[PDB]
Amino acid sequence: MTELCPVYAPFFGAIGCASAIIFTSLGAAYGTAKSGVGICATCVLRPDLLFKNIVPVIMAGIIAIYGLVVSVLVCYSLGQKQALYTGFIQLGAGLSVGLSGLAAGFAIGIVGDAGVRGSSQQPRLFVGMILILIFAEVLGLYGLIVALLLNSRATQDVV
């Protein structure tokens, strides 16, 4: 327990590991629940567009894998005698992917239910739905890029 490596330093990395998988699961949960209401209300009428309409739920399920691959990399850099700088970096890497995935999941849910309700009246709207959902999907990938760029600097030149 030095001044640059205290004992409360794994607190920040431990709640940065938890905050990555928590806030991507809430985003994926809203993006699955909001979208799955509009799928179950639309495949009553059109039962053969069911596998076509499943694609916003798959897009929401990718967001939780981003938080999973951030949480398993922060966890392998945790230690008892680590620095505070490492704990700050692991907080930043958790919160970036967590809140970016939360916002991306809100967007994917709200776009996806309206898209599957509108694509079953006009079949030429299903490609526009995928085009909007790709723009909503990359908002979590930016937080994944930031979380992977922070974690690369957690133990570079750290004493």
Partner: protein, 369 residues
């Protein structure tokens, strides 16, 4: 107007009032009236094996089934049923039908729960298939005497298997009798099913007797009525004992509604498929796929399609089953229409079949096609 039933147990309340708990002198207390040509006939359901090695000599069901057979209004249809059944219990083709449907006479928690929920869902769909099959025989031209109790037995067995699967999955998930008895007596209420004769069997093994209110005997009876008659067994050139059993088999198969040249072999096996002689005629498999597409997409598209198909209107099916439902989209409610998208190659095949035989629709609801 083929059959009618009642469920009030207070009209003939003399034979069920006191403790009449013995088949001995049960026919002696059965006269009790001006019943002479209508008293010994009702006893004939329990006369062969109702005393000769009988447990308890009665029960609550076995005596209530005898006085719900009021036959005072007319006694011709059930007399022909008593002559037709038990004249069919002589051939070995009925004997092997009562052997295939009878015996000799961690992650594993997820796997077991998956087995139980599969049992629940599969035995729950077939109950609905049979509930929309007892309103097909409500239509004019059908029968309600042999069809109605035969497919009110199978729905009860499927409801029991569905409840058994759900109780098993719940008892397995919450850990890793009184609940199955609570669903058993509950399905014993409501309407009252008509009687069918008893089908006693006396072969070299012994004197067996099945019930026809149990689903195994019902499920073993319709497999017997499946195949068409061959070049033998109906000609007047081997007239040994065939004009009393094959005539009875054909009058039951026609009483269902099946033609004498329809094959209808069961297909549930792990073996190789129906080879070529029991394989359908390529305008039947297309029609069977059309019926399976009608069952799989709505809970009310089989009875109006059969009603239209009996009128010869089987090309107008796409525009008589269409109906509109609302969809609250992002631009207001739109009222789209659900319709059965039958292709033309399966819309003319339903013109090849004139009327659906009830025996085909009961293999459809049980899963044998």
């Amino acid at each position: 107007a083929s059959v009618s039933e009642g469920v009030l147990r207070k009209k003939y309340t003399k034979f069920f009032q006191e403790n009449i708990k013995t088949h001995l002198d049960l026919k002696q207390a059965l006269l009790k009236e001006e019943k002479p040509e209508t008293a010994l006939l009702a006893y004939s359901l329990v006369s062969p094996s109702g005393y000769r090695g009988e447990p308890l000599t009665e029960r609550k069901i076995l005596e209530v089934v005898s006085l719900l057979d009021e036959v005072k209004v007319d006694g011709d249809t059930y007399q022909q049923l008593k002559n037709t059944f038990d004249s069919i219990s002589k051939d070995p083709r009925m004997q092997v039908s009562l052997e295939n449907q009878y015996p000799g006479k961690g992650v594993g928690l997820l796997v077991a729960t998956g087995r139980e929920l599969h049992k629940a869902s599969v035995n729950g769909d077939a109950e609905a298939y049979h509930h929309q099959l007892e309103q097909i025989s409500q239509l004019p031209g059908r029968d309600q005497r042999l069809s109605m109790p035969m497919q009110q037995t199978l729905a009860i067995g499927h409801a029991m298997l569905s409840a058994e699967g759900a109780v098993g999955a719940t008892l397995g998930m919450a850990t890793g009798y009184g609940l199955n008895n609570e669903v058993q007596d509950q399905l014993k209420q409501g309407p009252m099913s008509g009687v069918l004769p008893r089908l006693e069997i006396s072969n070299v093994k012994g004197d067996f007797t099945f019930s026809m209110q149990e689903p195994a005997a019902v499920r073993a009876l319709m497999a017997y009525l499946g195949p068409k008659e061959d070049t033998s067994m109906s000609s007047p050139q081997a007239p040994k004992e065939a004009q009393e059993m094959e005539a009875a088999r054909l009058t039951l198969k026609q009483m269902l509604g099946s033609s004498p040249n329809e094959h209808l072999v069961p297909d549930v096996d792990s073996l190789l498929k129906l080879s070529d002689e029991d394989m359908p005629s390529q305008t039947e498999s297309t029609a069977n796929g059309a019926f399976k597409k009608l069952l799989s997409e709505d809970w009310d598209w089989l009875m109006p399609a059969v009603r239209a198909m009996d009128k010869g209107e089987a090309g107008k099916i796409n525009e008589k089953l269409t109906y509109k439902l609302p969809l609250d989209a992002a631009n207001g409610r739109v009222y789209l229409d659900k319709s059965p998208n039958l292709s033309d190659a399966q819309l003319d095949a339903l013109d090849k079949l004139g009327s659906p035989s009830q025996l085909r629709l009961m293999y459809l609801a049980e899963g044998w096609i």
